[PDB]
Amino acid sequence: KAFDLVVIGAGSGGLEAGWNAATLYGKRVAVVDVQTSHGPPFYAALGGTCVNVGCVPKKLMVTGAQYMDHLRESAGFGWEFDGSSVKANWKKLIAAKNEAVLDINKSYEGMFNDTEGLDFFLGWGSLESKNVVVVRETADPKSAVKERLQADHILLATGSWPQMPAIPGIEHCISSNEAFYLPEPPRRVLTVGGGFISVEFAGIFNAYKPPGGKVTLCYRNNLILRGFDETIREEVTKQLTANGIEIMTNENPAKVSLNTDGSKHVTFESGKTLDVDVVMMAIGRIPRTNDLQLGNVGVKLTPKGGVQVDEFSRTNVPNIYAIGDITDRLMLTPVAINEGAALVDTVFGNKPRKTDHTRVASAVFSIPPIGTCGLIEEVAAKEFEKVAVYMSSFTPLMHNISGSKYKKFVAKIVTNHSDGTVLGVHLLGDGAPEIIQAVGVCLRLNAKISDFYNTIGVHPTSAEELCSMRTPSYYYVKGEKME
Amino acid sequence: KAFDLVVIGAGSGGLEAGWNAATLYGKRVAVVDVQTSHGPPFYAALGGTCVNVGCVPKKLMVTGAQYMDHLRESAGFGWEFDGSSVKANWKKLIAAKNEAVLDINKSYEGMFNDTEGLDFFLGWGSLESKNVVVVRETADPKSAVKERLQADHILLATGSWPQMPAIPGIEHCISSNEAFYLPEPPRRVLTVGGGFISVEFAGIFNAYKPPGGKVTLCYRNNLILRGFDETIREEVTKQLTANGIEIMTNENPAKVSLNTDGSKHVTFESGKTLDVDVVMMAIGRIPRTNDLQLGNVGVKLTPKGGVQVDEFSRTNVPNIYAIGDITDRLMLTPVAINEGAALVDTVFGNKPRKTDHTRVASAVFSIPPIGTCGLIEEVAAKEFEKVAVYMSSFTPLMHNISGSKYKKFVAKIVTNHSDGTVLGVHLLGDGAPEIIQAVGVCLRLNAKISDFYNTIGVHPTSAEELCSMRTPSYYYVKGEKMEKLP
Numbered sequence: 001k002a003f004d005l006v007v008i009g010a011g012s013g014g015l016e017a018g019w020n021a022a023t024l025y026g027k028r029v030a031v032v033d034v035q036t037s038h039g040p041p042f043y044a045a046l047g048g049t050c051v052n053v054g055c056v057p058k059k060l061m062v063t064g065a066q067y068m069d070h071l072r073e074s075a076g077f078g079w080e081f082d083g084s085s086v087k088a089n090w091k092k093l094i095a096a097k098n099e100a101v102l103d104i105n106k107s108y109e110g111m112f113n114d115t116e117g118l119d120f121f122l123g124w125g126s127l128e129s130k131n132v133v134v135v136r137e138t139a140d141p142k143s144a145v146k147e148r149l150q151a152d153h154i155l156l157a158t159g160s161w162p163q164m165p166a167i168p169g170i171e172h173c174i175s176s177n178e179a180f181y182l183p184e185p186p187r188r189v190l191t192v193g194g195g196f197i198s199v200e201f202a203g204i205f206n207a208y209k210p211p212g213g214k215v216t217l218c219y220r221n222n223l224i225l226r227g228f229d230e231t232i233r234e235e236v237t238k239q240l241t242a243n244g245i246e247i248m249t250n251e252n253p254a255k256v257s258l259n260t261d262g263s264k265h266v267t268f269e270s271g272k273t274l275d276v277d278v279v280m281m282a283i284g285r286i287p288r289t290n291d292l293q294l295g296n297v298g299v300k301l302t303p304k305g306g307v308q309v310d311e312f313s314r315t316n317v318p319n320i321y322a323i324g325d326i327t328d329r330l331m332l333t334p335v336a337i338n339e340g341a342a343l344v345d346t347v348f349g350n351k352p353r354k355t356d357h358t359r360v361a362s363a364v365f366s367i368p369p370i371g372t373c374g375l376i377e378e379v380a381a382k383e384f385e386k387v388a389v390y391m392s393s394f395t396p397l398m399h400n401i402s403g404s405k406y407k408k409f410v411a412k413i414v415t416n417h418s419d420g421t422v423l424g425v426h427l428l429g430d431g432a433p434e435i436i437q438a439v440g441v442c443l444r445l446n447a448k449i450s451d452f453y454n455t456i457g458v459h460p461t462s463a464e465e466l467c468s469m470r471t472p473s474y475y476y477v478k479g480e481k482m483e
Numbered sequence: 484k485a486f487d488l489v490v491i492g493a494g495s496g497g498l499e500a501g502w503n504a505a506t507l508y509g510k511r512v513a514v515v516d517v518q519t520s521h522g523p524p525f526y527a528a529l530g531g532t533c534v535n536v537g538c539v540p541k542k543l544m545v546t547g548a549q550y551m552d553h554l555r556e557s558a559g560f561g562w563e564f565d566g567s568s569v570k571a572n573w574k575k576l577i578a579a580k581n582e583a584v585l586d587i588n589k590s591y592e593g594m595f596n597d598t599e600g601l602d603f604f605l606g607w608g609s610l611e612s613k614n615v616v617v618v619r620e621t622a623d624p625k626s627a628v629k630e631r632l633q634a635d636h637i638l639l640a641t642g643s644w645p646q647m648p649a650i651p652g653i654e655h656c657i658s659s660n661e662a663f664y665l666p667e668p669p670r671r672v673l674t675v676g677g678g679f680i681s682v683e684f685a686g687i688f689n690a691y692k693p694p695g696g697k698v699t700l701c702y703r704n705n706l707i708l709r710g711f712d713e714t715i716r717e718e719v720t721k722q723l724t725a726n727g728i729e730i731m732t733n734e735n736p737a738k739v740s741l742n743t744d745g746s747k748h749v750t751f752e753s754g755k756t757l758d759v760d761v762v763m764m765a766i767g768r769i770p771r772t773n774d775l776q777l778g779n780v781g782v783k784l785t786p787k788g789g790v791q792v793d794e795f796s797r798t799n800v801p802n803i804y805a806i807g808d809i810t811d812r813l814m815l816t817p818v819a820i821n822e823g824a825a826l827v828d829t830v831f832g833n834k835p836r837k838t839d840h841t842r843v844a845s846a847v848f849s850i851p852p853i854g855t856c857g858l859i860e861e862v863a864a865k866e867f868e869k870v871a872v873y874m875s876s877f878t879p880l881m882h883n884i885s886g887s888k889y890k891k892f893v894a895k896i897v898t899n900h901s902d903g904t905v906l907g908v909h910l911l912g913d914g915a916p917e918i919i920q921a922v923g924v925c926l927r928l929n930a931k932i933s934d935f936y937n938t939i940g941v942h943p944t945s946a947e948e949l950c951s952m953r954t955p956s957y958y959y960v961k962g963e964k965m966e967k968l969p
């Protein structure tokens with residue numbers, strides 16, 4: 001069958017591109033994915049990684065984990081109940097999450113059923129030729145051919161996949177994919193990695209662990225969450241520790257073996273040992289290009305395996321484009337969506353647009369969470385002669401009373417001190433992901449620190465700290481920190 | 484006894500002005516207040532109304548109230564416990580709030596001693612003359628002079644005070660002042676008024692009521708929260724009703740009598756009656772001008788009764804200024820603070836600056852809460868030829884799992900459709916007050932709808948809805964509502 005556009009991967013970016021091309025530009029569109037609903041064996045499905053095994057289910061599970069803190073914190077406000085009756089029923093959480101995800105799966109199914117000129121094909125998409133997508137039974141390119149789709153234009157939108165270190169016993173470990181389907185909450189779990197997925201899952205597992213359970217997070221480098229503001233990295237380390245999570249910095253698994261009872265015996269490079277029920281590897285995500293048979297058309301890959309693209313998401317092959325995680329830039333759902341919309345506007349609208357990958361608001365749903373937008377000060381200090389840091393850090397009042405006195409809210413604004421232009425805003429504490437969104441809009445409008453401190457506060461909020469900082473805490477002059 | 488600046492009222496506006504003058508411009512500042520710490524008899528104290536009997540304790544108490552919802556909602560996420568064992572200990576909450584507020588009172592005491600020039604005087608400020616404030620022992624002008632203060636400049640910052648309707652049995656009723664110190668949580672309460680204080684307290688009382696409890700909110704007109712977005716007014720009304728609060732609209736107490744058991748018999752204008760344990764009046768706050776003796780120096784008051792001021796907070800009398808609730812405009816702490824900061828940066832900094840009373844972000848800590856900045860559409864529609872309204876309203880997913888399906892999140896953007904300029908943003912739902920703060924910065928920057936929709940979303944959040952709206956839901960054209968433009 002013949003299509004204006006064939007999209008390989010029915011995910012965040014692929015569905016934005018396919019829907020826009022079909023509905024805004026009246027193109028005949030085919031979209032291919034390996035599964036119509038969430039979970040094993042292929043985990044991602046119609047809706048993409050975010051819907052099925054990412055942002056959506058993880059936010060529901062972090063919300064669930066937050067009740068451990070609410071139940072404890074309620075006491076400071078006079079709430080009373082039988083503490084010994086308290087159980088975290090992980091089975092109920094997983095069943096609730098599975099229904100929410102399946103409902104989305106079903107709605108996307110309905111969207112393809114109800115949207116003329118937008119067609120879904122089930123199976124494994126690869127490039128036969130520069131104008132032909134082949135859909136096969138399995139990832140094996142010798143598997144049976146279900147469809148051959150003639151394509152004026154081809155969008156690669158297959159996303160990324162968890163990286164598993166080729167160590168002894170890798171097969172006894174899981175990724176985030178399986179973590180979403182654990183039938184029982186692990187008593188002892190090792191999260192491997194200092195990234196958002198490791199930290200977020202450490203929080204989830206910490207809340208739902210059975211009695212006498214323990215969550216351990218291991219990271220090779222000295223301080224979790226590289227790429228984030230350094231004050232926040234230190235404070236979120238302290239606040240995880242305070243909620244009973246063991247942070248093992250400068251540690252990596254060398255091998256995993258099964259104890260006789262089937263639990264996991266972990267040997268860390270430092271020689272050290274840990275016995276756990278689950279080893280969750282969250283050390284990286286790699287672009288999913290292996291199965292695309294891109295050798296058939298000579299699409300240029302990086303050594304890593306990302307599809308190389310210009311700022312308009314164009315491969316070295318005309319009529320073949322790539323957006324989202326397969327491009328191995330910013331692995332965020334709204335970025336994938338923005339790239340897909342920008343690509344379709346450019347190609348089918350002749351409305352030339354490229355995604356701005358700077359000043360993108362993002363979050364970590366740690367407990368407590370992070371909200372951030374733009375540059376951290378160390379990065380700003382290499383690109384700007386004079387950098388000012390405005391910092392406010394304090395245990396909010398609700399948290400003196402709650403008993404979580406360790407829950408310091410951190411609000412930091414990084415400026416170009418030459419003109420006051422805000423380069424970066426970094427938040428740690430309850431509400432941070434919600435606060436940071438409209439900060440994204442501020443940075444698009446080249447907000448200066450004077451635009452924040454001249455705005456009238458909303459009181460009482462954590463956010464008003466952003467509008468209360470008149471005077472730098474410290475500076476960088478020619479890369480050098482000065483108090 | 485000689486000062487650059489004498490401030491009457493050590494509140495939100497008074498302290499900002501006092502401390503800035505001192506620490507920024509090395510000026511010599513006297514600040515008068517009637518009380519050094521919270522509670523009866525004068526309720527407000529060092530720190531002002533917000534600290535003592537306002538934003539600060541209210542927010543701690545609404546946070547406490549929120550646990551009623553969290554405890555229930557936890558079950559959807561698999562939390563299990565003995566629901567029959569749950570008790571809300573009001574006495575614990577009030578003791579915790581009292582300790583929190585006292586620590587802040589003590590925080591400000593340090594500030595006054597730990598700061599040269601800046602000195603606190605205790606007692607009642609009044610105007611003797613253009614350049615003399617007299618501190619007396621009571622609010623009676625005839626009471627003993629504790630101090631006579633010489634003033635190159637006088638700031639009036641005495642704030643506001645609850646208005647109590649002059650009905651038979653008003654003495655059986657309380658204001659928000661007494662509500663902060665009730666020894667027991669009322670089983671049955673009538674909150675009187677449709678403003679943020681009545682709505683916030685209805686939520687608090689609703690969470691802490693003993694078994695067989697009932698919270699009734701009455702309002703004299705048809706729909707609570709006048710001045711807020713209409714969609715949000717109707718939605719809050721529904722969401723409060725869904726959480727067990729009875730909203731009596733078009734009803735107003737005509738009198739209250741004590742029943743023989745100490746309970747309150749409320750007779751409405753309509754002839755309806757209701758028995759409650761507490762009648763909390765929250766029908767308005769009025770500026771505290773009486774006690775300053777303004778007739779002595781001829782400071783002019785408004786047809787409404789607030790100190791008349793120009794954009795620079797200047798009275799008709801040179802050297803004499805007024806900020807915050809005494810000016811009877813926007814009664815918000817951050818507005819008071821902004822006015823104080825501007826007045827001092829003006830007069831002492833030689834850097835004249837005027838508070839912008841437009842595009843002010845504010846909140847209602849209703850459950851769920853309101854976050855708002857700028858114009859409601861009905862107001863926009865009278866100023867601008869063509870107004871667009873962008874609206875997204877849905878029960879967020881977590882609240883489908885939580886069982887609170889009635890918690891619809893409302894995001895509304897109101898624009899000048901001629902150029903896309905955002906005139907107002909109106910949010911209802913968890914996190915609305917936090918989301919709206921940086922929206923206030925956006926509006927100061929004259930953000931257009933396209934600045935919001937071209938910004939990349941943070942996912943998953945409620946806030947990202949603000950960056951997802953490209954197409955108007957409807958318009959006002961020369962005042963007229965319609966789905967489509969001509």
Ligand SMILES: Cc1cc2nc3c(=O)[nH]c(=O)nc-3n(C[C@H](O)[C@H](O)[C@H](O)COP(=O)(O)OP(=O)(O)OC[C@H]3O[C@@H](n4cnc5c(N)ncnc54)[C@H](O)[C@@H]3O)c2cc1C
Pocket residue numbers: 008009010011012013014032033034035042044045046047048049050051053054055056058123124125126157158159160176197288291292323324325326330331332333334336942943
């Ligand atoms: C645990 C986790 C949490 C995350 N949390 C967040 C978060 O909170 N916020 C956020 O913004 N981002 C988050 N992300 C990242 C976000 O999920 C991704 O950036 C986003 O889904 C990428 O979108 P995409 O279009 O590139 O690909 P995807 O959404 O991954 O879609 C790719 C699709 O292609 C399909 N596919 C792959 N190969 C083939 C093939 N050969 N033929 C057919 N179909 C194929 C897959 O089945 C999949 O459905 C998270 C990711 C993970 C793993």
Ligand SMILES: Cc1cc2nc3c(=O)[nH]c(=O)nc-3n(C[C@H](O)[C@H](O)[C@H](O)COP(=O)(O)OP(=O)(O)OC[C@H]3O[C@@H](n4cnc5c(N)ncnc54)[C@H](O)[C@@H]3O)c2cc1C
Pocket residue numbers: 459460491492493494495496497515516517518525527528529530531532533534536537538539541606607608609640641642643659680771774775806807808809813814815816817819
């Ligand atoms: C229940 C309630 C909840 C509120 N919630 C919020 C909220 O969440 N957010 C918000 O922004 N605003 C809120 N407000 C409003 C806020 O409290 C006021 O806007 C703010 O306190 C006004 O500050 P001000 O400087 O005008 O005076 P105040 O802060 O009221 O200070 C006035 C001070 O003057 C003193 N005083 C009065 N007369 C004299 C005299 N003659 N001599 C000496 N001292 C005198 C008083 O003791 C008092 O301390 C709330 C108000 C109340 C009542």
Ligand SMILES: COC(=O)c1cccc(NS(C)(=O)=O)c1
Pocket residue numbers: 043161162164170171172173174175177178
């Ligand atoms: C051999 O390592 C793997 O590829 C491996 C091992 C164990 C588990 C997984 N989970 S997955 C395919 O979902 O990423 C991969």
Ligand SMILES: COC(=O)c1cccc(NS(C)(=O)=O)c1
Pocket residue numbers: 645647653654655656657658660661
């Ligand atoms: C006019 O004042 C009253 O009649 C009255 C009645 C009942 C209570 C109060 N408490 S107050 C002064 O704090 O607002 C005043």
Ligand SMILES: [Br-]
Pocket residue numbers: 221222223226
């Ligand atoms: Br490091």
Ligand SMILES: [Mg+2]
Pocket residue numbers: 111112113114115116117118119120
């Ligand atoms: Mg179709």
Ligand SMILES: [Mg+2]
Pocket residue numbers: 594595596597598599600601602603
């Ligand atoms: Mg002093």
